[PDB]
Amino acid sequence: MNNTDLIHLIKHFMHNELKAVEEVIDSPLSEFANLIKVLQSCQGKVVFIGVGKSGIIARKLAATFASTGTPSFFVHGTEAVHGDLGMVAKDDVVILISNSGETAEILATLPSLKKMGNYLISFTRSHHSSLAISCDLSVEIPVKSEADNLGLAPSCSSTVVLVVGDAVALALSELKKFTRADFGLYHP
Numbered sequence: 001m002n003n004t005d006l007i008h009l010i011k012h013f014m015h016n017e018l019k020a021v022e023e024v025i026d027s028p029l030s031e032f033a034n035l036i037k038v039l040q041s042c043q044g045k046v047v048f049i050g051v052g053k054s055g056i057i058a059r060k061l062a063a064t065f066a067s068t069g070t071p072s073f074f075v076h077g078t079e080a081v082h083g084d085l086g087m088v089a090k091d092d093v094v095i096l097i098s099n100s101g102e103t104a105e106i107l108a109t110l111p112s113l114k115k116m117g118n119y120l121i122s123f124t125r126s127h128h129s130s131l132a133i134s135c136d137l138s139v140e141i142p143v144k145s146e147a148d149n150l151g152l153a154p155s156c157s158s159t160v161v162l163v164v165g166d167a168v169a170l171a172l173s174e175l176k177k178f179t180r181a182d183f184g185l186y187h188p
C-alpha cells in the first residue's frame with residue numbers, strides 16, 4: 001500500500017472512533033444526572049472494576065477521578081473474586097465496566113457484592129444486560145460497532161467509555177470546586 005493510502009487507512013479507523021463518540025454526545029444521556037448525584041453522595045471511595053480492555057479503561061478512569069478530586073481506585077474483576085473484594089468497604093460505591101454486560105468474570109463478582117451491600121453502578125452497552133439488570137444504577141453507553149472490519153476489537157467501545165468517564169470525572173471536579181492548588185498537591 002502506498003504512503004497516501006496508508007495514511008487514509010489510519011484515518012479511516014480514527015474516524016470510526018470519532019463517529020462512536022459523536023453517537024454518544026448526540027444521545028440524551030438521561031441517567032447521567034442521577035450518576036452525578038450518586039457519585040457526589042459517595043462517602044468512601046469510587047471503586048472501578050473491569051477486566052480486559054474495559055479493565056484498562058477502568059484503571060485510567062480511577063486514576064482520573066482521583067487526580068481531579070474524587071478518591072477512587074481500580075480492582076480487577078478476577079482479582080476481586082480471589083480476595084480483592086476485601087478492598088471494598090461499606091461506604092464505597094462500585095462502578096463495574098463491561099461493554100457487553102455479560103462478561104463472566106464481572107458477573108462473578110455480583111453475589112458477593114450484593115451481600116456486601118454497596119451501591120453498584122454499571123457502564124454497559126445495554127440496560128438489558130445481565131450486569132445492568134443486577135446493578136442499582138445502569139448507565140447505558142451505546143456502541144453500535146467496533147472500528148475493525150470484523151467488529152471484534154475494543155476500539156470504538158473502550159474509547160467511548162473513556163471519553164464518557166473523563167467527562168463525568170471533570171464535571172464532579174468542577175462541581176466540588178477542585179482547585180489548581182489541590183491538583184498541585186496530588187501532582188508534585
Ligand SMILES: O=P(O)(O)OC[C@@H](O)[C@@H](O)[C@H](O)CO
Pocket residue numbers: 051052053054055097098099100101102103106152153154
Ligand atoms: O467489556 P467486556 O464486554 O467486559 O469485555 C471484556 C473483554 O473481553 C474485552 O474488553 C477484552 O479486552 C476483549 O476484547
